[PDB]
Design a protein around this ligand. Structure first.
Ligand SMILES: Clc1ccc(C2(c3cc4ccccc4c4nccn34)CC2)cc1
Ligand SMILES: Clc1ccc(C2(c3cc4ccccc4c4nccn34)CC2)cc1
Length: 301
């Protein structure tokens, strides 16, 4: 972890970066702020290139599309909670998911949007904006406080509230027992495993393959080849995370490093070519009148 770059928000006595994601254009990072703005920064020079007020509440999530034509945002209390934007030449709104507080693109073919409203998931067409599916079964609900519905890498399976759904037939194929309050889980990029908190499950047997205690309460983020795995533990504008992140070998699940930046972490993401890790770290504390986040770029590398 060699530091390469650092910067704060331009013309702000209190920097308010809340989340980050690399743009499709190499050398440029996208950041949400607490004033619900989206900002394009040259990650090396720390120059602000563009800005736009997407919401009147803090950004909690953002996701650029791989072709750089579209972008998802999720705010805090502003209705609409989440929206889809276009960024071909001009920035503009395409659609708005009114009550969905968290949203993701499909992975293989990026033609659909998966939104989360508590325990319920909704799939939407990008072109038309229409609700195609609603995935929810009150009998199989685990009610994870931090549930995030998500597609597998081939877009034919969906994980929501600890239930694996077949999209084609829109039937719940398996329900995973609940062993924590908060984390709902992700697909491994190799699309053979499912990481639900400390438990790694096989998609072919539903057998427990690994117990990883160090992963407890981590929001997990992979590198783009899926050989490395970065976690930020939740706490027990307050940050969702504490001051340490952990790295793991993503094939055998052995720990590699536990960096403690000694500053609460807001978000953490990877470039397409597996050279860099951007991290939003807070110079303030919770009890500080204001946030003061910076963006640190480390090469891994
Ligand atoms: Cl386990 C988990 C899953 C998802 C989240 C969200 C989130 C919330 C938030 C609130 C305030 C400031 C920053 C953030 C943030 N930055 C990156 C993610 N988030 C997407 C809601 C948190 C924890
Ligand atoms: Cl938050 C936001 C606001 C506006 C934009 C656009 C944009 C994209 C772009 C891509 C590469 C290099 C420079 C730019 C640029 N500079 C100013 C406009 N843009 C109009 C899409 C993007 C994000």
């Amino acid at each position: 972890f060699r530091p390469i770059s650092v910067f704060r928000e331009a013309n702000e006595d209190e920097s308010g970066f809340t989340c980050c994601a690399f743009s499709a254009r190499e050398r440029f990072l996208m950041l949400g702020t607490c004033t619900g703005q989206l900002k394009l920064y040259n990650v090396f020079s720390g120059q602000e290139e563009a800005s736009y007020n997407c919401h009147n509440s803090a950004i909690t999530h953002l996701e650029p599309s791989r072709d750089g034509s579209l972008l998802l945002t999720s705010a805090t209390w502003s209705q609409p909670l989440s929206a889809l934007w276009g960024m071909k030449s001009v920035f503009d709104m395409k659609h708005s998911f009114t009550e969905d507080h968290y949203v993701e693109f499909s992975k293989h073919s990026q033609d659909r949007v998966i939104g989360t409203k508590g325990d319920i998931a909704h799939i939407y067409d990008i072109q038309t904006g229409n609700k195609l599916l609603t995935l929810f079964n009150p009998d199989l609900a685990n009610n994870y406080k931090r549930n995030c519905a998500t597609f597998n890498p081939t877009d034919d399976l969906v994980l929501n509230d600890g239930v694996l759904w077949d999209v084609r037939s829109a039937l719940a194929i398996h329900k995973f027992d609940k062993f924590n309050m908060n984390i709902s889980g992700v697909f491994h990029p190799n699309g053979l495993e499912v990481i639900i908190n400390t438990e790694i499950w096989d998609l072919r047997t539903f057998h427990l393959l690994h117990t990883v205690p160090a992963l407890d309460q981590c929001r997990v983020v992979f590198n783009h080849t899926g050989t490395v795995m970065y976690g930020a533990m939740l706490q027990a504008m307050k940050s969702p995370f504490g001051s340490s992140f952990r790295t793991f070998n993503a094939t055998d699940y052995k720990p590699i490093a536990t960096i403690d930046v000694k500053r609460n972490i807001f978000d953490l993401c990877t470039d397409t070519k597996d050279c860099y890790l951007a991290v939003i770290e807070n110079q303030g504390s919770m009890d500080a009148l204001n946030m003061d986040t910076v963006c640190r770029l480390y090469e891994v590398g």
